[PDB]
UniProtKB/Swiss-Prot annotation, chain A:
GO biological process, one term: systemic acquired resistance, salicylic acid mediated signaling pathway
Family, as annotated: Belongs to the class-I pyridoxal-phosphate-dependent aminotransferase family. LL-diaminopimelate aminotransferase subfamily.
Reaction(s) this enzyme catalyzes, per UniProt: (2S,6S)-2,6-diaminopimelate + 2-oxoglutarate = (S)-2,3,4,5-tetrahydrodipicolinate + L-glutamate + H2O + H(+)
The name this protein goes by in its record: LL-diaminopimelate aminotransferase, chloroplastic
Pathway: Amino-acid biosynthesis; L-lysine biosynthesis via DAP pathway; LL-2,6-diaminopimelate from (S)-tetrahydrodipicolinate (aminotransferase route): step 1/1
Further remark: The expected covalent binding of pyridoxal phosphate by Lys-252 has not been observed in the 3D-structure.
Organism of origin: Arabidopsis thaliana (Mouse-ear cress)
Positions with a binding annotation for pyridoxal 5'-phosphate: Y76, A110, K111, Y134, N191, Y222, S249, F250, S251, R260, N291
N6-(pyridoxal phosphate)lysine modifications at: K252
Gene: DAP
Keywords assigned by UniProt, alphabetized: Aminotransferase, Chloroplast, Plastid, Pyridoxal phosphate, Transferase, Transit peptide
Length: 410, 411
C-alpha cells in the first residue's frame, strides 16, 4: 500500500487509549450483543435526557424562522458572540464581580473551549489537574505536547501534576504538597467526585496560584447544581481576577448537550509574565480558529437568561437533583461510602478492594446498568464508580431497584 | 500590577498583526464613527446576505420544537455527526468517488476544521500554501508552531512554502519550482483570486504530492460556484485517495455563515509514513477537542441535501453569480485588469503602482464601500483588491455606480 512521507504527530502517539466516553458507549454495545433482550439503563455518560423547556426552544425556532426573512437574516457573527448575549451572561452570572461584557467569549461548549485554551497556552506550559477529573484536561494536554509519555506503573502521563482528591482530604488537594505548574485546571462542583470547594478552599487555591504565578482554568459547568452555601464562580474570591479564568456551559442547565453553547470569562487583570493580557491572545485564537457559536444556539441561550428561562432551568436542574437524591439514598441504604450527589448530578461510590473497571463490568453484566469507572478519570479515581443522575425518573427508580437486588448480601 | 509567571506562547508572539477580517470590520466601524450617516456598502468580508430558504429553516424550526418533546429530544450526538447526514454528504457530493459515510466528519464549519486538522498534524510539519490565499491556513500554521518569524522584507513567515499564483501563470503555480513540504493547502475555486484548477492541473497537483509524499488539504468551500467544466472535488482525480483530504461548508451554499455547518472527508487510503491512517488521528481529535456540530444545524444541513434543498441552494448561488457579473463588467468597463468572478463569488482587481491597503482606504473614504486589500491574503496579493459579490442586488448596483463615478474620469 502507498503511504505518505508525513510523520504521525508524536503527541498523538503518546495517548495510551481512546477517549473514555466513546469506549463506554462501545462496552455497552458489546453488552447488548451478549444480551440482545436486555433493557439497558444508562447512568454512565453524563448526558441530559429531559426535553428543553418550551420557552427556550420557541426562541430557537423563532430565530430559525427569522433567518428566512430579509429583515431577520444574519450571516457571520462576531466570533466572541452577540453583544446582548455576552452582556446577559456577564450580568446574570458575574454581576458585582467586576466582569465586563468584553471579558465574555461565547463558544459552542466548554469541551471546545478547553482545547482552544490549550492551543493558546501552547506546548511549553506545564499543567496541574485534580485527580480524579474530567479526562479532556489531561488528553488535551497530551495532544498539545505538554506532557511526557504515559507511565503504566503509576497510570500517569509524565510532567502533569496530578492533585489527589480523596475522602481523607475532603476531595480538595493538599496544596502544600502540590508542585508548581503554569496552569491549574480546577473543576467545581467536580466531575466525577461531585465535590464543591468552599470559600475557604477556593481562597487557598487563589493564594496558591498567586504565589506560584499560575493561571487557574476554573470549570464551573455544574455550578448551578450547588446546594451548599459555596461560591459558584472563582471571581467571588478577591484576587481571582489576577490569576483565574472560568469556563462554563448551558449543556447541563438547559439540556444543550446537542445544541452547543458555552462561554469563557477572561478578566482584564490576567497577565502573562511579560505583562501581555491573556484575553488578547484568547481573542486571537477565537478569531482565527473558530467562526462563532451557532446563531440559533445563541438565540436559545439569550432566552435562557430571562425570568422565564431561569425559572425553566431551575426546574430542569431540580429534577436531576431529585434523581441524585434517589441514587444517594439507594447506595447509603446498601451500606456504601457514597460521596458527591449534594452539589452535583453525580454520585461517587467507593468500591474499596476492587478495580473500578471490574465493578463497571460487574454492574453492567448483572444489572444491565451502565456506570462510569473511576479510573477513567485518572489514577485517583481507582476504587470508585461514578453514577450519573441524568435520566427519566422511572429509569432512575428502576436502576436503583436493580442495585438493591444486586447488592443486598453485600 | 500583578503578572503571573506563565510565559506567553511564543507562537502567538510570532503573529504579525491581528486576523484580517476583524481588522476590516474595525476599519468599517471607525469609518462609521467618522461618518455616522454614511450609507456604507460592504463588499469586503465575504458574507452571505440573502435569507436561508424556507425549506431549510422549517427543518431547523421543526428540530427545535422536537427538542421540547419527550420523544423528539436528543442530547449529545456522535462527535463525527449524525449518520444520516454523513451518508447524505457522502452520496450527494462524493457519490461514485469511493467515499464512505465513515470518511465524513461533520463540523461547525471549515474554519474550525482547518484548525483541528492543524492540531492533529502538530508543530513538526511544514506547509505550502497558494500565494495569495485565505489567511486562516497561514495563521493556524503560525499558531501551531509550524513556522519561523514574519520577515518584513518579503512579507512571509519563515518555513512556509508560498506557491506563487499570478495572472501570468493562470493562477496555478509552477510545481517544478515548489519545494517539498509535508502539507499542501490548496483552495479551488481559490479565495481571493477566484481561480479554479483544471482537471489537468489537479492531476499535476496529485502527482506532485504523491512523488513528494505530501498530504493535500483541499478546500472546496466555493466548488458549487463552478461554471467551467472543472473538477469540484479533489477525489475526482484518481490517486487523490492516497494523498488528499477535503474540507467544505454549507456557509456559502445555504447562507449558513451564522448557522455553522461543514465537513471534512479523509479517505481510508491516506496514511502517515508509519502506515497509520490519518482519519484515525482526526477521529481522536474530534472526540477530544469537540462535542459535535449543533443538532439543529445538522437538521438544517440534512434538509439541504434533498431535491428542494438542492434547488434552493442552486438558486441562491446563481443570484450571487449574477452579482459577480455586474461587478466584473463595471471594472472591465473602467479599464482595469480584472480576474476571477467566473467560478467564484469574488472579483480580483489589479491596481498597479498602489498599495492595496491604500486603495482599500481610498475606496472606503470616498465611496463608503468596503473591499478587501489583496495584501491581506499574502504578499502575492499586493497590488490587488478583492471585491465580494455577496449582497442585495440594489446594493451591488449602487456600489458599482459609486465605483464608476469615482473612477470614470481617471481610467
Ligand atoms: C466537567 C465538564 N466540563 C465540560 C463538559 C463538556 O461541556 P460541553 O457540553 O462541551 O459544553 C462536561 C460534560 N461531561 C459529561 C459528558 C461526557 C461526554 C461528552 N461527549 C464529552 O466528551 O464531554 C460526562 O462527564 O459524562 C463536564 O463534565
Ligand atoms: C476559502 C475559505 N475556506 C473557509 C471559509 C470559512 O468557512 P466556514 O464559514 O467556517 O464554514 C471561507 C470564508 N471566508 C470569507 C469570510 C471571512 C470571515 C469569517 N469570519 C472567517 O474568518 O472565515 C472571506 O474570505 O471573506 C473561505 O473563504
Amino acid at each position: 500500500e502507498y503511504k505518505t512521507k508525513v510523520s504521525r504527530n508524536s503527541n498523538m502517539s503518546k495517548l495510551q487509549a481512546g477517549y473514555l466516553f466513546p469506549e463506554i458507549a462501545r462496552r455497552r454495545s458489546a453488552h447488548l450483543l451478549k444480551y440482545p433482550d436486555a433493557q439497558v439503563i444508562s447512568l454512565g455518560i453524563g448526558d441530559t435526557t429531559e426535553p428543553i423547556p418550551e420557552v427556550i426552544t420557541s426562541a430557537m425556532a423563532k430565530k430559525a424562522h427569522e433567518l428566512s426573512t430579509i429583515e431577520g437574516y444574519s450571516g457571520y457573527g462576531a466570533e466572541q458572540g452577540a453583544k446582548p448575549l455576552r452582556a446577559a451572561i456577564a450580568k446574570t452570572f458575574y454581576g458585582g464581580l467586576g466582569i465586563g461584557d468584553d471579558d465574555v467569549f461565547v463558544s459552542d461548549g466548554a469541551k471546545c473551549d478547553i482545547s482552544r485554551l490549550q492551543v493558546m497556552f501552547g506546548s511549553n506550559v506545564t499543567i496541574a489537574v485534580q485527580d480524579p477529573s474530567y479526562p479532556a484536561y489531561v488528553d488535551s494536554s497530551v495532544i498539545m505536547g505538554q506532557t511526557g509519555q504515559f507511565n503504566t506503573d503509576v497510570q500517569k502521563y509524565g510532567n502533569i501534576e496530578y492533585m489527589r482528591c480523596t475522602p481523607e482530604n475532603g476531595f480538595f488537594p493538599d496544596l502544600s504538597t502540590v508542585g508548581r505548574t503554569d496552569i491549574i485546571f480546577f473543576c467545581s462542583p467536580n466531575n466525577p467526585t461531585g465535590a464543591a470547594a468552599t470559600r475557604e478552599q477556593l481562597t487557598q487555591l487563589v493564594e496558591f496560584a498567586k504565589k506560584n504565578g499560575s493561571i487557574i482554568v476554573y470549570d464551573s459547568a455544574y455550578a448551578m447544581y450547588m446546594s451548599d452555601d459555596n461560591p459558584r464562580s472563582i471571581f467571588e474570591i478577591p484576587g481571582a481576577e489576577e490569576v483565574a479564568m472560568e469556563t462554563a456551559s448551558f449543556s447541563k442547565y438547559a439540556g444543550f448537550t446537542g445544541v452547543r453553547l458555552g462561554w469563557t470569562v477572561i478578566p482584564k487583570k490576567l497577565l502573562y509574565s511579560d505583562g501581555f493580557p491573556v484575553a488578547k491572545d484568547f481573542n486571537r485564537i477565537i478569531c482565527t480558529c473558530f467562526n462563532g457559536a451557532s446563531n440559533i444556539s445563541q438565540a436559545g441561550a439569550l432566552a435562557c437568561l430571562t425570568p422565564e428561562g431561569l425559572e425553566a432551568m431551575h426546574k430542569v436542574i431540580g429534577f436531576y437533583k431529585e434523581n441524585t437524591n434517589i441514587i444517594i439514598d439507594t447506595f447509603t441504604s446498601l451500606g456504601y461510602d457514597v460521596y458527591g450527589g449534594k452539589n452535583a448530578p453525580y454520585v461517587w461510590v467507593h468500591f474499596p478492594n476492587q478495580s473500578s473497571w471490574d465493578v463497571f463490568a460487574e454492574i453492567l453484566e448483572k444489572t444491565h446498568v451502565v456506570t462510569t469507572p473511576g479510573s477513567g478519570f485518572g489514577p485517583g479515581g481507582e476504587g470508585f464508580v461514578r453514577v450519573s443522575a441524568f435520566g427519566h425518573r422511572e429509569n432512575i427508580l428502576e436502576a436503583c431497584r436493580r442495585f438493591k437486588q444486586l447488592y443486598k448480601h453485600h
